[PDB]
Ligand binder design. Structure first.
Ligand SMILES: [Zn+2]
Ligand SMILES: [Zn+2]
Lengths: 382, 382
């Protein structure tokens, strides 16, 4: 029997190779295989400005992220389910990870907050919505996503040691509630996976408390929450240094909302397996391209006659055809094609970064790759 | 009082300067002034592939052409009138010339033909339509066009001396009928103009017979028909040599469906004041650009790194920004913007040709311009 004819497991994480704290391997799921370390582009509605799903796939993405908060405001979770689920809605038939909605409640919406959950006003039309461990898992079930995030409590940066601890403890009680809600639905529990989220801010003892609590409940994967919220890379790396080793070794480790290319490399050096970020898309819409020599602003006059591709080594479809000069022309003209090409290149560049990370770990030369990568990225000889 | 506040005449042709048989001047109409010699781009439906009317105007066009045959098949003349007329339909508030429909009947449609008129089947849906001097003028009235073409009979190329003569005589009887139908409608006769069409193929005596007949009826302008239908430039110029002097000197002379840039220059040398052609649009959609060094095929590999504009001297909006290299990229990608840019440039190049013709006649150096133009256009040092 071929691989195509073979039964696919619900969730199987295998580690193929290690170098220090870094790992490379695969997550097998029913909708496909995810190569790790993995970068997940953030999915959106299919507007004139969004890439086609076949384009996103061709950049190398194995899985994309859906924002539960935005999908529950428009067109709503029940509507997405009636349309066949999020995979049908987005035209993406591979795995999808959904966040819980809890972060955007804090950052974008808030009527009531308690141990029960939260009620909040749409930032769009003032309507009231409710989220809780139970409602968040139910909505992610309606979306049909493959990896479900537990609902937790975010504490804004920077947080009092007092605020850090009470928020982490509530998040751990909410993590058990998320577990039980997920397990209550046979359709979800047999076909999807559930990740828990470690909290504790910068405090090693709180982080250990959270890790032990999550490990006692048991999850398919573990995210490190509370980072990439304003703390700077130095602090972020310091927290990762002691937080990641606390999580179960044989499950994936997910750093949510990270990030810049150098953030990703250093986080993999510290044991992270999964990443998401809007940065390649946001940068692409704003005329900024990622390259191995650092970011470039394509509107700069120096690019108007530059016949080289955006990046000298990138093998994305954009760089195999389009010059800096012509992408500069399109962006300066306000032509949507310009932003589309930048965005495709940026997402593909992120995937090629992940592939170089995976390859170098497999070959036992990742520590040297990370050194070579930083020297060149920060030299900015673009 | 300013020019903007002053009464505009129905149709006033003034000749400002002459060099040999060539003339430059103006046609004043109620919807604006037409600089002559004039090139009229052919207008179409507002599809994703059509230029915006403000873009067509900005290329220098003072008047555009509407194809009566196509407009009467879709959406139909009565529909265009209900929508406010052709100017409202097309978003073009300056003068419009409509042809009679008779040429496309021959070339595209034919159920019945007699001295009465013709009945024919749509090449689209088989429906039956009728045209005659009277019906053609009525339809052009429904369209609201500013310059109306008499309905004549085309004889396909090459035509027997027998066919040439009977067709010209019928066309002259149909020219009187067109005159009387036009004059029957106060709204049309007070606000629009009517052109007659000389026929006679290559036979000088037939052409003189036609000219005398048209001059006896009396028209606001006179077209030279029966050319640009396969005869080649040598023959075309030979016929123009004796045909144009037969027409009234103090009225505009219109060569329908011409043509290539060198055709236009030589026809102005022979006394033609007005031109139309689909060539700038057809070429633009097919990846061909007109330049002072001859046409170029932008898909050619030699243009992939050429940072020069399409033409070295053209001051159209495309050439003030876009390189050959980037228009090559767009065309090779099948991006509609590529064809749009080529088409805008081609129409603007035609207008800049007409402006150089007008300027050189005014300065008494048109004969030298025509010599300089041919030497460079045919050398093809692009
Ligand atoms: Zn690229
Ligand atoms: Zn141009």
């Amino acid at each position: 029997a071929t691989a195509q004819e073979t039964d696919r497991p619900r969730f199987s994480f295998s580690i193929a190779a290690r170098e220090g704290k870094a790992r490379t391997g695969t997550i097998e799921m029913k909708r496909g295989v995810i190569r790790t370390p993995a970068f997940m582009p953030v999915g959106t509605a299919a507007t004139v400005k969004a890439l086609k799903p076949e384009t996103v796939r061709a950049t190398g993405a194995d899985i994309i992220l859906g924002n539960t908060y935005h999908l529950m405001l428009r067109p709503g979770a029940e509507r997405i389910a009636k349309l066949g689920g999020l995979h049908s809605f987005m035209g993406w038939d591979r795995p999808i990870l959904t966040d819980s909605g809890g972060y955007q409640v804090m950052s974008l919406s808030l009527t009531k907050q308690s141990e029960e959950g939260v009620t909040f006003k749409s930032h769009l039309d003032g309507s009231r919505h409710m989220l809780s461990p139970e409602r968040s898992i139910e909505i992610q079930h309606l979306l049909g996503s493959d990896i479900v995030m537990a609902f937790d409590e975010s504490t804004p940066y920077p947080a009092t040691p007092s605020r850090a601890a009470s928020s982490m403890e509530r998040s751990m009680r909410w993590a058990k509630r998320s577990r039980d809600a997920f397990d209550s639905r046979k359709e979800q529990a047999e076909n999807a996976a559930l990740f828990g989220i470690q909290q504790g801010s910068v405090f090693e003892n709180l982080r250990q408390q959270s890790a032990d609590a999550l490990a006692e409940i048991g999850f398919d994967g573990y995210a490190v929450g509370g980072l990439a919220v304003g703390e700077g890379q130095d602090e972020m790396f310091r927290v990762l240094d002691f937080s990641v080793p606390m999580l179960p070794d044989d499950k994936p480790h997910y750093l949510m909302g990270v990030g810049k290319p150098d953030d990703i490399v250093g986080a993999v050096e510290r044991g992270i397996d999964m990443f998401d970020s809007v940065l390649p898309t946001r940068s692409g819409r704003n005329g900024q391209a990622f390259t191995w020599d650092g970011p470039i602003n394509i509107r700069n006059a120096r690019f108007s006659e530059d016949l080289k591709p955006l990046d000298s080594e990138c093998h994305c479809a954009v760089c195999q055809k389009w010059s800096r000069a012509c992408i500069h022309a399109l962006i300066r003209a306000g032509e949507i094609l310009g932003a589309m090409l930048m965005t495709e290149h940026n997402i593909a560049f992120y995937q090629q970064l992940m592939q170089k990370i995976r390859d170098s770990i497999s070959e036992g030369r990742f520590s040297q790759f990370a050194q070579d990568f930083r020297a060149r990225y920060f030299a900015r000889n673009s």
